[PDB]
Amino acid sequence: KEEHQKEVQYEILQKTIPTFEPKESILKKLEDIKPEQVKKQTKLFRIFEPRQLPVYRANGEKELRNRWYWKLKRDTLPDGDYDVREYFLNLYDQVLTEMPDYLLLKDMAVENKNSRDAGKVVDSETAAICDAIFQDEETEGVVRRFIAEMRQRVQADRNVVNYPSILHPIDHAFNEYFLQHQLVEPLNNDIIFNYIPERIRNDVNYILNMDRNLPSTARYIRPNLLQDRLNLHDNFESLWDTITTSNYILARSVVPDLKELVSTEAQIQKMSQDLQLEALTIQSETQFLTGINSQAANDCFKTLIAAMLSQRTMSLDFVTTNYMSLISGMWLLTVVPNDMFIRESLVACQLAIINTIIYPAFGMQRMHYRNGDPQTPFQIAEQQIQNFQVANWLHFVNNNQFRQVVIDGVLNQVLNDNIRNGHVVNQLMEALMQLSRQQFPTMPVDYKRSIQRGILLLSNRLGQLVDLTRLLAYNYETLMACITMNMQHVQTLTTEKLQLTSVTSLCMLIGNATVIPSPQTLFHYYNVNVNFHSNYNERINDAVAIITAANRLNLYQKKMKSIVEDFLKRLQIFDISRVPDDQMYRLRDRLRLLPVEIRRLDIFNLILMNMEQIERASDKIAQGVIIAYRDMQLERDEMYGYVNIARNLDGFQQINLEELMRTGDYAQITNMLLNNQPVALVGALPFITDSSVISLVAKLDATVFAQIVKLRKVDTLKPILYKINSDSNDFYLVANYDWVPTSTTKVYKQIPQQFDFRASMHMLTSNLTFTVYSDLLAFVSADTVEPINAVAFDNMRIMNEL
Amino acid sequence: NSRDAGKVVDSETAAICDAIFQDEETEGVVRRFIAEMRQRVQADRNVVN
Amino acid sequence: QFDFRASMHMLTSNLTFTVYSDLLAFVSADTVEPINAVAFDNMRIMNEL
Amino acid sequence: RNLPSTARYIRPNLLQDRLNLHDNFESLWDTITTSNYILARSVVPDLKE
Numbered sequence: 001k002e003e004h005q006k007e008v009q010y011e012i013l014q015k016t017i018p019t020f021e022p023k024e025s026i027l028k029k030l031e032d033i034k035p036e037q038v039k040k041q042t043k044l045f046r047i048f049e050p051r052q053l054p055v056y057r058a059n060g061e062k063e064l065r066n067r068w069y070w071k072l073k074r075d076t077l078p079d080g081d082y083d084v085r086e087y088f089l090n091l092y093d094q095v096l097t098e099m100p101d102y103l104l105l106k107d108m109a110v111e112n113k114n115s116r117d118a119g120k121v122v123d124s125e126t127a128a129i130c131d132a133i134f135q136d137e138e139t140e141g142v143v144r145r146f147i148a149e150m151r152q153r154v155q156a157d158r159n160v161v162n163y164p165s166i167l168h169p170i171d172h173a174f175n176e177y178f179l180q181h182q183l184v185e186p187l188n189n190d191i192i193f194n195y196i197p198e199r200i201r202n203d204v205n206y207i208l209n210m211d212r213n214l215p216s217t218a219r220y221i222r223p224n225l226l227q228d229r230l231n232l233h234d235n236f237e238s239l240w241d242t243i244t245t246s247n248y249i250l251a252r253s254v255v256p257d258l259k260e261l262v263s264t265e266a267q268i269q270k271m272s273q274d275l276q277l278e279a280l281t282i283q284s285e286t287q288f289l290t291g292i293n294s295q296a297a298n299d300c301f302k303t304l305i306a307a308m309l310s311q312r313t314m315s316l317d318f319v320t321t322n323y324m325s326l327i328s329g330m331w332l333l334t335v336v337p338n339d340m341f342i343r344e345s346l347v348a349c350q351l352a353i354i355n356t357i358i359y360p361a362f363g364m365q366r367m368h369y370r371n372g373d374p375q376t377p378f379q380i381a382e383q384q385i386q387n388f389q390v391a392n393w394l395h396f397v398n399n400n401q402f403r404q405v406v407i408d409g410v411l412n413q414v415l416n417d418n419i420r421n422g423h424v425v426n427q428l429m430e431a432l433m434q435l436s437r438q439q440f441p442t443m444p445v446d447y448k449r450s451i452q453r454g455i456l457l458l459s460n461r462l463g464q465l466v467d468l469t470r471l472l473a474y475n476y477e478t479l480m481a482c483i484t485m486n487m488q489h490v491q492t493l494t495t496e497k498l499q500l501t502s503v504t505s506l507c508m509l510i511g512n513a514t515v516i517p518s519p520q521t522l523f524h525y526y527n528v529n530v531n532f533h534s535n536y537n538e539r540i541n542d543a544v545a546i547i548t549a550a551n552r553l554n555l556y557q558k559k560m561k562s563i564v565e566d567f568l569k570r571l572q573i574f575d576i577s578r579v580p581d582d583q584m585y586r587l588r589d590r591l592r593l594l595p596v597e598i599r600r601l602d603i604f605n606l607i608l609m610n611m612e613q614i615e616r617a618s619d620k621i622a623q624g625v626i627i628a629y630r631d632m633q634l635e636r637d638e639m640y641g642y643v644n645i646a647r648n649l650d651g652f653q654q655i656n657l658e659e660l661m662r663t664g665d666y667a668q669i670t671n672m673l674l675n676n677q678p679v680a681l682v683g684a685l686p687f688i689t690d691s692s693v694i695s696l697v698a699k700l701d702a703t704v705f706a707q708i709v710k711l712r713k714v715d716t717l718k719p720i721l722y723k724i725n726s727d728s729n730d731f732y733l734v735a736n737y738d739w740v741p742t743s744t745t746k747v748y749k750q751i752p753q754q755f756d757f758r759a760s761m762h763m764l765t766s767n768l769t770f771t772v773y774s775d776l777l778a779f780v781s782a783d784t785v786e787p788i789n790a791v792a793f794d795n796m797r798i799m800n801e802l
Numbered sequence: 803n804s805r806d807a808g809k810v811v812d813s814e815t816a817a818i819c820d821a822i823f824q825d826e827e828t829e830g831v832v833r834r835f836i837a838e839m840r841q842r843v844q845a846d847r848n849v850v851n
Numbered sequence: 852q853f854d855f856r857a858s859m860h861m862l863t864s865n866l867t868f869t870v871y872s873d874l875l876a877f878v879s880a881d882t883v884e885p886i887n888a889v890a891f892d893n894m895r896i897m898n899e900l
Numbered sequence: 901r902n903l904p905s906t907a908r909y910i911r912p913n914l915l916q917d918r919l920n921l922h923d924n925f926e927s928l929w930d931t932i933t934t935s936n937y938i939l940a941r942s943v944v945p946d947l948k949e
Contacts, residue, residue: 006876012869013901237904281949282884313902321884342902356883365893442895447886491902557807580867580906585845662805662837664823665830811862822855832855839859848866848906868908877901885948 017494018574019242026249029572033531036538038184038221038772041100042108044123044175047614048168049073050755052132053639059735060641060725065138068755069639070168070617077618077684079715081658084621084684085553088611092549095174095603096542101221102184105163105766112150120152122163122764129166133757143757159217159768166760170610177606179766181599187218192776197481197526198408205790206519207783214779217770223530224537225484227410230590233488236583239574241492244312246573248496251306254525256475257298260513264293267508274453275324280446284321291501297509300502304336305476307496311413311489314496316345320352324454325500327432328507329353331458332500334393334428335419335469337401338376342495350377357451358385363441390431396424402489411486420473421794422466432459457508463801464511470798471514477793478517482526484533514790514799519782527777535571543567544591545600552608560588567591615684616750624649624682624748625719627673627705634722634741639751641725644701646746649680657683657714670709680748687719687747691728695720701745721747803833808840 020026051071055063077084110127112119114134121127130147133139153162167175189210193201200206232240268289277285307314316332318325329349338346347369354377355366362385369377382394402413418424436455440448458465480487517525543563550558561584568574616623626646634642655669672679690700701720708714722743725731734741773779784790792798803823810816819836822828842851882888890896921929 002876005873009871009873009876010901012871013903016869016904016906237906282886284884317879320881352883356887360887366889443887493902493904495901556805559807582845582848582866582906585843585866589845663830664803664833664837667830835856835859843866845866848868849863850866851861851863868906870908870910872910874909877903 013493015578016580017238017241018568018576018579019245019494020573020575023245023249026246026573027253030246030250030528030532033528033535033572035223035527035531035774036221036534038101038774039098040102040104040107041098041178044108044125044165044167044171045095045178046125046167046171047072048171048617049125050129050132053752055638056641056725057638058636058641060728060731062726067138067638068133068136069752070755071752072614072617075618075620077615077621079621079685081656081684082555082557084615085555088607088614089546089549089553089555092604092607093546095607096545096600099599099603100178102182102219102770102772103179103766104769105161105764106154106768109152109163112147115148115150117149117151119148119150120163121150122165126164126166154768156768159770160765161768162763162765165762165764166757167762169759170606170613172760172762173606173610174603175764177602179764181602183221183599184219184770184772185222186216187214187220187773187776189214189779191220192779195776196780199481200478200519200522203478205516205785205787206522207785208519209781209783210779211781212779214773215771217768219770219772220774220776221772223534224541225409225530225533226537227486228536229594230540230587233490235586237490237493238579239583239587240490241494242574244310244490244492245494247310248306248312250525250528251309251479252302254479254517254521255302255305256515256517258301258510258513258515260511261294261297261509262511264509268292271324271454271457271508274457275450276446276453277450280450282321284319287319288322288324291499292505292508294505294509296499296502297505300498300506301472303496303498303502304472305479308336308340308413308476309479309483309487311340311487312496313340313342313492314498315342316349316500317497318349318500320348320356322500323356323451324457324504326353326357327455327458328503329500331425331428331465331507332503333378333397334400334424335472337415338397339401339489342491347371347377354378354381357435358390360443361435361438361440362387363439387434389427389434393424393427393431396427410483411488412480412483413487413489414477414480415473419469420477420792421796422469425462425465425469429459429462432456461507465507467512467799467801468506468510470792471516474792474798475516478522479525482522482529484526484529485536512799512802514787516784516787516790519784523777523780523782527775532571539567539570540591540594541597541600544594545596545604547591548596548601549604552604561585564588564591617752620686621684622687622719622721622747622749623684624654624680625685625687625717626652626678626680626746626748627702628652628678628744628746629676630678630744631742632744632746634743637751640723642722642741644720644722644743644746646748647750649682649748652678652680654680654682657681657685657717661714664712666709666712673705673709681717682748685717685719687721687749689721689723691723691725693724693728693730693733693741696722696724696741696743697733699743701743719747720745721749803836804840805837806840810839810841 048070049072050068052066053069053071055065055067057063077087105122109120109122110124112121112127113131121130134144134147150164152164153160155161165172165175193210196208201208230236232243271289271292275288277288303314306312316329318329320326326349330353333346333349351367351369358381359366364384367377367380376398378394379398382391382398385391385394396418400416400419403416405412405414416424432455436452436459440451543566546563547560550560564584564587565576567587568576568579615621624646626649632644634644637643637645653672660666660669669679690696701722704717704719707716724734724741788802790798803819810819823833823836844850886897888896919925921932
């Protein structure tokens with residue numbers, strides 16, 4: 001039982017490859033990779049909102065009025081600086097999530113309820129402000145008259161609308177960004193004409209016509225067909241194998257099936273009676289003419305084209321007692337490049353041909369081949385063979401490789417132009433006629449004859465094989481035109497099988513019925529690749545942006561592969577529990593060394609220049625506490641009355657807490673709380689607003705630090721913020737007793753931001769009700785000639801042996 | 803107890819570390835040490851420390 | 852006396868190799884057709900009647 | 901199959917007989933010899949026509 005032993009190790013190696021189980025499933029997935037849908041917002045971006053809060057003059061008496069202050073929507077900031085920076089990262093990624101591609105301001109405008117000239121404004125949450133500002137008896141007259149007298153500027157002959165708005169400068173930054181950085185481009189017929197690949201519209205077999213007008217208000221989005229800048233083709237063997245397999249399975253589904261084949265039985269009778277095996281005394285009697293049927297020939301036809309289009313390396317499994325398989329394999333080596341095959345199978349095929357056809361015909365000793373020879377067997381034969389008709393063919397084969405060319409911005413693995421036109425096969429059949437005409441000096445005759453006649457079979461299929469080669473090449477290049485990513489050559493780990501019975505079927509069952517892709521299949525095969533390439537680039541951009549933001553926000557508890565796995569999960573072709581780890585880390589490394597997409601960086605920069613300003617709103621945290629063992633006088637504010645508040649954090653030893661918890665090293669702080677040294681403990685932490693003079697006299701503020709020396713963990717540090725004023729229930733102790741309100745332990749926190757109409761009234765411009773077309777090859781009516789009269793590159797028709 | 807939430811080699815190593823971190827008599831320097839000990843990868847060489 | 856910093860080490864290891872026991876599974880072999888099978892002298896065996 | 905650079909194998913110790921059981925251990929050598937004989941019988945081909 002040494003056959004399952006294979007399966008064990010092939011499974012070992014397949015547990016390393018992120019290729020799903022049954023291959024066909026992959027096709028369902030790449031089609032599901034749709035274009036990037038286009039987004040829009042019907043509501044402005046708003047982190048702040050006004051709030052009409054109380055005030056307190058000095059002596060803590062509440063004035064008879066309120067005042068308008070900016071305050072955050074949804075105060076949710078946590079404790080700890082690390083967690084706050086995580087909050088801002090979770091803000092950044094969800095802004096990128098709702099990052100609109102185009103805006104339109106009439107889709108959200110509303111009427112000003114207080115205007116003489118039918119004034120509108122842009123959003124409900126600015127009219128809700130304007131009407132409040134319009135009836136507040138503390139507001140100044142010109143603001144009222146201006147609100148009454150604002151007037152939008154709609155203008156359709158230019159397609160622009162200006163609308164007023166009221167919002168915080170931060171929100172204005174985000175919204176003027178979204179307005180001024182719209183990634184929708186004007187559309188028209190010529191962009192659709194050039195979106196088509198060039199060598200499909202310079203072609204004549206595919207006629208193309210525009211039959212749909214597009215207005216000026218049509219838009220599209222230039223996708224990101226930016227080539228592979230991770231370079232998964234060097235030292236990413238498994239991922240590249242999976243990519244190549246996916247492209248193979250995609251390419252199989254667009255190759256044209258082929259038709260009007262020869263009667264299989266008519267070739268089977270003929271081959272049987274020409275080879276005459278029953279006359280012989282060998283043990284391959286039924287096994288020669290296996291796989292000769294149809295459903296093998298079309299398989300090979302698809303497999304060759306798909307494997308060249310994917311650079312999926314494929315092998316050569318065959319029986320060596322079946323010289324017909326070899327006589328077809330020489331055709332294969334002739335037309336198909338050598339570098340497409342894994343080396344060992346290539347050598348095996350050539351060596352079988354040599355030791356079974358060529359040398360015993362010319363009358364040479366067989367060989368003694370060394371496995372690690374640089375010099376391929378046909379290369380030795382090219383020098384040992386003294387004949388032109390066969391050695392020139394060998395010269396062709398030994399130097400039949402792909403040729404690299406950058407066409408239309410994409411790399412391309414193109415052929416020789418003595419193959420695209422089928423002319424080299426004439427040389428092949430010259431060699432084969434020679435091998436027919438020879439004496440096989442040492443050989444028996446019943447076997448010699450069968451070999452010669454099996455050769456004559458393909459020597460009679462000359463024109464049909466010219467036709468085959470030309471058709472194969474044509475379909476290959478037409479499908480090559482519909483590719484967006486560079487198509488590069490690497491020896492893949494796992495390898496598609498190819499049965500030379502199938503090549504025999506193809507070479508012996510075909511004639512005079514031309515098949516070429518429909519334009520719909522071509523458009524499909526182009527859209528799919530475009531969508532996959534676009535998704536690839538967009539996911540790389542997102543990944544790098546998040547990595548860079550985590551590293552600039554100093555997020556270090558994080559592990560980065562959780563991003564990388566998502567980068568592989570969104571690309572719908574990889575199984576992540578299956579890839580190695582070293583590749584994941586090389587991918588991390590190559591991601592870090594890439595620039596950032598400009599929008600994803602501009603948003604981040606907007607957040608960094610303001611995240612200090614958001615964190616200082618949000619009355620649930622404080623930006624530090626002070627300890628100063630000296631009876632300091634409470635200072636007076638307008639929002640509060642008397643407060644133990646600080647706004648400089650100067651003249652003290654700043655101890656940071658996110659380090660003091662991650663280094664458990666409390667000697668420096670225990671040697672300062674025990675000895676009562678003034679300090680400043682900085683870091684986002686809670687507080688509470690005590691509102692009794694008793695708890696000030698009773699000195700509650702200083703009793704909130706023993707839990708540190710007891711419980712080293714600094715998380716439940718919850719200072720005091722004495723707001724004591726006219727409505728604190730023990731305020732008589734102030735205005736009747738002639739004493740300064742004092743305490744130590746000030747808290748580092750910043751006053752809210754007062755509202756100002758002029759630094760918030762803005763005029764936002766946008767367009768009018770344009771459209772955004774996503775699928776745009778639908779604006780192209782394509783057609784193709786009768787394939788009986790269709791032409792290759794050479795201006796001749798194709799399959800001309802009618 | 804690691805600053806970078808990194809890894810160590812074996813369950814008993816981490817057991818020792820977590821026993822010694824949580825104690826009272828241990829210095830702050832051993833706690834700093836435990837915080838500042840993590841793995842290193844280098845996939846160019848496929849090597850990990 | 853137990854010394855934490857002194858007793859600490861950094862251990863190297865390769866990252867994610869794979870191991871195989873059978874080795875000729877990957878090889879698929881076959882014979883020439885035995886009528887034209889040849890010995891060490893490049894001269895056919897069983898070439899009589 | 902094109903095996904990667906991320907693969908390993910164990911090399912057997914095919915070192916010769918240190919003990920020289922063909923020298924004054926005739927019974928053990930007869931048993932070894934018999935085992936190899938009956939093994940080699942199984943793998944000789946059967947004669948064709």
